[PDB]
Amino acid sequence: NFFDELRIGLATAEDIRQWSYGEVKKPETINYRTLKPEKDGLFCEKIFGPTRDWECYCGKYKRVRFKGIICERCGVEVTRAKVRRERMGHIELAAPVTHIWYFKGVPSRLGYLLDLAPKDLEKIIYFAAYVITSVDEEMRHNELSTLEAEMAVERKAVEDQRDGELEARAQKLEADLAELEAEGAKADARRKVRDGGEREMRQIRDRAQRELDRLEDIWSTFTKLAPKQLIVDENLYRELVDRYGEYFTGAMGAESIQKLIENFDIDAEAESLRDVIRNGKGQKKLRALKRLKVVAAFQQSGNSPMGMVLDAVPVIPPELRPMVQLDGGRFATSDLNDLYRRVINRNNRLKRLIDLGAPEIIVNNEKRMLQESVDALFDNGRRGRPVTGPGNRPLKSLSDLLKGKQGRFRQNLLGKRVDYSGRSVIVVGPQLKLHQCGLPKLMALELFKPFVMKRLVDLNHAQNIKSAKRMVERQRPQVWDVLEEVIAEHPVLLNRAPTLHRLGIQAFEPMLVEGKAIQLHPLVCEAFNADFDGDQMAVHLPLSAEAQAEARILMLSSNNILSPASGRPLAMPRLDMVTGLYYLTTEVPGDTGEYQPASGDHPETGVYSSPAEAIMAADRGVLSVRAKIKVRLTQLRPPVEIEAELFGHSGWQPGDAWMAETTLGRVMFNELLPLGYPFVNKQMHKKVQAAIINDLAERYPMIVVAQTVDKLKDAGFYWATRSGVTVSMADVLVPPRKKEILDHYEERADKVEKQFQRGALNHDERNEALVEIWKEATDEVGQALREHYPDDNPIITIVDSGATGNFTQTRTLAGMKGLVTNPKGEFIPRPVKSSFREGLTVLEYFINTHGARKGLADTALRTADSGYLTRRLVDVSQDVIVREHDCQTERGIVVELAERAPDGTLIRDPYIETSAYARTLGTDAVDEAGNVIVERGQDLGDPEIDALLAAGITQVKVRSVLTCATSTGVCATCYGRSMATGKLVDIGEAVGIVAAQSIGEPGTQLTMRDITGGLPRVQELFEARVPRGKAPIADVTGRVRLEDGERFYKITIVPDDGGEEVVYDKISKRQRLRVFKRVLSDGDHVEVGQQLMEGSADPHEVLRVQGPREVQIHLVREVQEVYRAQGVSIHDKHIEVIVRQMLRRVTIIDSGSTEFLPGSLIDRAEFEAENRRVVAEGGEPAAGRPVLMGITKASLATDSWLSAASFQETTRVLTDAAINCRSDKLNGLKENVIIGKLIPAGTGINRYRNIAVQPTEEARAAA
DNA sequence: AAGTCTAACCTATAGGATACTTACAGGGACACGGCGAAT
RNA sequence: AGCGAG
DNA sequence: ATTCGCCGTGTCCCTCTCGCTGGCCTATAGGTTAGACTT
């Protein structure tokens, strides 16, 4: 494999016949009976190749020795049967045809190149109007006079005819008058002939005038006749040609367009376009820019446009165009055969017709047929009507195999079915270890079949590979002995679709299990989002030693305890385990065997010599595992204070002793944590366990953390059972004051309803009043309920301990359901007053159904919206790979980090764990000329945050991805800590995909609540769409004058400088202005960019008026606000990576002198390089401006056409790449994935991919 | 058993003469085109 | 065309 | 009436993944091809 470039471009007919191994003539596929491809047919062996390996049509050649020889009678080259898959055919068109893509795709590249228009082009090519290929006008000055004489002569003849007609009409009128006056009749009767003669002469002179005007019109057109015009009125074309056919050439159809392109200079058109843009303006300027792009695509490159009009069409080989019998031997081909056959039929008929010689009408018709058929072949449905086979189904065309999901790109390149794989339903495997997963032997046998045969053949269980195959297929007993051996230390990847985030795929060590279900360690469930209710999961087998190393090291379950999103652990006790630990470690005052300071009657009688004595006592009904006792701990480090006081500085604690007023349950728990962890002595509410595991991961090695979570799972499962947390109707206690307060609130509801009946307020007013009153009612009922429940209740125990569920669910269970959403989104003002325990009545259930159904449908659609957003984010930010240890730059954003309180205090800012942690300092922290507290270029973790807060400093400068000064991808330090590892990132981590996936996975959790505020808001922000309500923002400092205009608000910002008074008047009075320390108090000195009105701010205007730093900060701020409304913790640095990928192009206004379009987007790096280059050898430095692109446009406007082709708009991307003759460099993750070579991320980078290993000198010595 | 030697079969071409004349979502975005002031 | 998991 | 600047309307590519089940009529010359004897 030696790949470097895919330089797609226009394929001229010469190349088409160059590829072709032959030329299919007739539309004959397969013989009726012998089932053999015909000669010169669409499958002919001589053209494509032999359908059977080592054979030929007549069959006189069958041996392999004379390979590569073509027979005599039938002329079939003796090669492999598979060579048909590659050799390609072609067909010669009698008349040229136009490629559908360039002609019809909007904007019409053909029209832009030839200055013509879409409907006009449709008319000329499809034989509806004529076009002039060229005309030579230079020798027309004398010809002007000569033809003037000729036309004067014919006009004299026309006048002769006209006066003859007039004289004849006059004679007829005289005769009619003589005949009428010769007989007596009505006066009107005898003057009717006079009227008729008058009308007849009138219409005669009218016709003469009209034809004279037509002659004069065609004369004027001839005076100013030029090429590139549509001659509608075929009769006029016939007149023009049969009178002056010579010296000017006209044509119709694709041949006419080809002639027009031939007699045309690209350089002249390019120079004209340059001149117009040099002196143009307005929409004329924009059209000039677009057409200049189209033409300069050809001009700058060596690809001429003559390849757009096709003389020969290629034929995809046969095996990509199957023809196979099936079912009852019924042949079942594909649709391309019909399209190709139609093209062939049209072509043969056209050839014959031209040969025989037919009137231009029929040949034009046949050419039109061939044109529309080639269009359907290349792209069905793009023009005319979708050619529909039987059943009115649009036949698949060659283009269709690209677009959409079913196309090649998204279906068989970016994801493929794989061998050595399987799937099954999953079940909880609590006896498993974290790094283990079960495997039903009926599946492991089939997966490892390749291996078991080897290990048994070499064990002589069989005597050859085939015999071993028999043993496996027979499932003979010995296999289960060898299988159990060939499976050990052989990881397998467990996957669960959808693979929302990076943790979806995890490598486990498999162990044999009986049954039919993949046993899954429960801890990893949260990583997979799996719940054992019928979930199916897939097992994949990594074969190669490199792959097995990747499975063991990179992807093993125990090596991945922290979510890449924000570092929150995922393999931590959850749900059942949380309840078990909460029961184990809580402290109930009054349980059996308390520690009492008794005197006189007896000593304390609460102390215990060792936890051994404690467990022995607790085995009998003497002590409870949640009672306060004074134990003598001798194997656990005490808390910080006890150790620091008793032992002073360095008191080791594997063999010492100390008193602890704890609960035996807590001692049991703390024995689970490592030997070094200080005794915690608390109640393990879920947040506490999260903190414990996070501390362990940050400080302790990974193996210790994995073992600790394993033991925590064990203890939690063991103790949740004895916790007796069960649900029963006696354990769901209704509040006692329900009826009275409900009656009082209903009385208030009746009062407001009476007010409505008197017209005191409108129906919306009373609806709002009822909704608000009943919301107060729900608040009161919930408060009373939470008051009533004692902590020992199973439901409140489950909820309070953080095992699962929110409290509002318990309010519904025993309380009232509250308001119920009307399907539009409003609130049904009844509202439900019956608790699910008490049993809803019929109408209340029917009302609740609205909310349930709308929730389900919203989830169904939002899942797809989230998936699409994830795909777009992944495509924008795939190239962002950490590929340098250090920028060594000096820039970097700042962080608020606990700003001072108004009274004076370092109240911690709410957002630190998602915007301050895991960064590298761009500066050194000094307080009031104090000592340097923390040094530059060091990882910033929680101890440094506590140090900073203690110091008295809040503003901090931190290195960030936004200010990364690297060329290709971000550098390590500018990125900072990696969440999953907890250390500084490697120099191969594909952090872009991590950012995209961690930003996308929270999706399907943000419910929409006019300016959007849910997932669609995040979509708008990333896509950079203009917001709905454009709240105007200030442009300059100074006091502001505000007036409540007629249905709007007028605002004038006094510019501090001599700026123009920015005045805004067209604002809906409904929207309220921004509020601040006042609702834009008249005269406020809002800054040059403060949002004046309260609403949404366009990122484009913010960038324009404040700069890239501010727009980056604003985008990250808004996206974080949207994600945090639902309490999701995601570090910005992912969002900053996305924003960085959005802001990497600059729009230019000065052409410089190096092939730059004013207003074309170009990446910053090449922009600066071009500016530096052009500064040398004639200084015209192009001055550009930053632009904020949308994610989709950023994905499309890339340097590689493969990624853009596979992303979306495949036809447009391919046409553009063909015209520009672009060349992919195969330097992207997605690309190398398609062509199946190592991705330049992780282990595929040159540094790690080229490691060389040989044993050390001492190792060679030991041999 | 291919190499003749014998005897069919099958199919692209062609040919026959009343009369008959017009089938049968939605959203965003951009590009192709209405309405108005200026020269 | 129907269905399971999210 | 053309220029330039606005609006206005029409036509088109995109919105998650992974499983499973079933359901006319000849006439003729030339190409082509069946079977059989053999040394």
Ligand SMILES: [Zn+2]
């Ligand atoms: Zn042959």
Ligand SMILES: [Zn+2]
């Ligand atoms: Zn950097």
